[PDB]
Amino acid sequence: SYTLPSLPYAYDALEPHFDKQTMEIHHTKHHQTYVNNANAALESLPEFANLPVEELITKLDQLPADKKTVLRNNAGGHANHSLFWKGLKKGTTLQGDLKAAIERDFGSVDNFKAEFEKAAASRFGSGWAWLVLKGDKLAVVSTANQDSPLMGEAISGASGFPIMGLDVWEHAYYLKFQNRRPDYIKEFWNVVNWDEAAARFAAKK
Amino acid sequence: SYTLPSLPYAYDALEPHFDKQTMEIHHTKHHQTYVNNANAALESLPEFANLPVEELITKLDQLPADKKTVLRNNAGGHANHSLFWKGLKKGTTLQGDLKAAIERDFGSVDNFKAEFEKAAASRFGSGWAWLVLKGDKLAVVSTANQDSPLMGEAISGASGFPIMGLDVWEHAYYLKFQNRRPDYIKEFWNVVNWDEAAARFAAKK
Ligand SMILES: [Mn+2]
Numbered sequence: 001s002y003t004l005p006s007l008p009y010a011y012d013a014l015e016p017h018f019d020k021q022t023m024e025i026h027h028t029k030h031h032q033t034y035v036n037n038a039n040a041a042l043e044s045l046p047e048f049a050n051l052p053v054e055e056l057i058t059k060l061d062q063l064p065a066d067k068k069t070v071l072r073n074n075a076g077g078h079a080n081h082s083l084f085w086k087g088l089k090k091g092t093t094l095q096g097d098l099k100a101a102i103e104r105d106f107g108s109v110d111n112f113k114a115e116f117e118k119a120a121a122s123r124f125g126s127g128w129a130w131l132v133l134k135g136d137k138l139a140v141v142s143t144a145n146q147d148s149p150l151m152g153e154a155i156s157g158a159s160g161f162p163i164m165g166l167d168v169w170e171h172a173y174y175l176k177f178q179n180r181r182p183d184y185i186k187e188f189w190n191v192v193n194w195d196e197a198a199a200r201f202a203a204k205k
Numbered sequence: 206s207y208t209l210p211s212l213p214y215a216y217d218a219l220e221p222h223f224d225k226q227t228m229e230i231h232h233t234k235h236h237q238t239y240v241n242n243a244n245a246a247l248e249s250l251p252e253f254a255n256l257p258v259e260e261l262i263t264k265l266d267q268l269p270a271d272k273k274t275v276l277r278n279n280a281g282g283h284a285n286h287s288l289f290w291k292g293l294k295k296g297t298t299l300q301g302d303l304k305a306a307i308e309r310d311f312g313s314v315d316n317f318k319a320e321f322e323k324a325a326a327s328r329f330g331s332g333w334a335w336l337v338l339k340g341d342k343l344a345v346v347s348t349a350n351q352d353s354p355l356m357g358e359a360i361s362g363a364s365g366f367p368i369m370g371l372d373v374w375e376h377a378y379y380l381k382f383q384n385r386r387p388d389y390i391k392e393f394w395n396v397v398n399w400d401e402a403a404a405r406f407a408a409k410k
């Protein structure tokens with residue numbers, strides 16, 4: 001069974017960018033539900049229940065047909081949110097190899113930001129925007145609902161190893177921003193953990 | 206061009222079931238945006254622009270490829286929300302031919318409510334739950350994002366003439382209910398306009 005990971009900071013630690021109320025509800029209610037639902041479907045599947053969630057989502061085709069959608073949605077939700085909490089932190093700065101790779105692949109940091117913002121704003125309905133690594137090149141992509149690029153192109157419509165991501169479901173920003181998703185996206189640049197992003201970039205897997 | 210319709214009641218008219226704050230934002234911001242985006246896309250297409258939105262959404266395949274998705278999302282959003290405001294009202298009661306048809310097709314009203322609630326709760330991500338008339342039988346179906354059953358099965362995954370619907374995008378309930386979608390769904394029974402639903406049932410088109 002999966003368990004809900006504890007946050008690596010307090011609930012008010014991303015203030016004044018991301019609000020304290022949302023952080024608590026997003027973690028304790030939304031993420032908790034995905035963990036609960038994934039665990040429930042997994043009770044009947046002992047062969048898969050032992051796996052790490054990031055590994056389980058790359059093997060959705062191996063699952064039984066009646067379990068596939070529920071695990072794609074819930075284990076996808078667990079994997080995405082787990083990555084999300086680790087990818088947030090105040091006071092980091094984009095530097096080094098990651099910064100150089102971004103400038104190499106996007107022209108400049110500003111071009112990268114514009115491309116990321118455009119992907120994040122254009123995802124209609126629920127979803128996520130991602131900065132992924134693929135073919136030794138960085139790229140910006142987006143997925144629907146709780147799909148991840150780790151699931152592969154056939155399922156998610158995208159692929160590659162996620163370096164960093166932004167949750168664009170309405171629950172992530174509604175309490176503070178309401179319909180103003182672009183304000184939320186602009187505010188995200190203040191809280192992206194560049195240290196963690198650099199760490200994932202260095203690791204590659 | 207499309208005009209944002211004015212509400213048939215005040216913003217606090219659905220209190221204490223649906224909150225005033227949400228009614229105002231949902232109408233003036235969300236619906237306004239769908240109207241704006243649809244109008245921007247229809248500017249070059251006078252052939253399609255003279256049509257009513259409900260008619261336009263049944264002819265998505267006849268549009269140019271670069272215009273199809275934007276119109277599916279935005280004219281779909283305009284059509285769904287327009288139907289939504291008219292389908293809400295306090296103090297109505299389910300009766301007559303519609304009540305008889307519901308009992309005929311579902312067994313009882315209670316069975317219908319359970320099936321509707323189940324469809325509305327199970328729609329993962331953004332979407333709508335609907336009570337449609339498929340020829341002569343009533344049925345409960347759901348669609349993703351701003352898709353409508355008027356678009357047909359090939360596009361939406363559902364079909365039939367919409368009698369009544371419930372918006373299950375997070376913006377429709379987050380300010381009051383947060384993650385508690387089932388509370389919002391239960392609260393919906395107090396504000397469903399049965400008179401309007403009966404009128405649509407009588408008309409059939
Ligand atoms: Mn989320």
Ligand SMILES: [Mn+2]
Nearest residue numbers: 235372374377
């Ligand atoms: Mn809506």
Ligand SMILES: [O-]
Nearest residue numbers: 167168169172
């Ligand atoms: O999410």
Ligand SMILES: [O-]
Nearest residue numbers: 372373374377
């Ligand atoms: O909506």
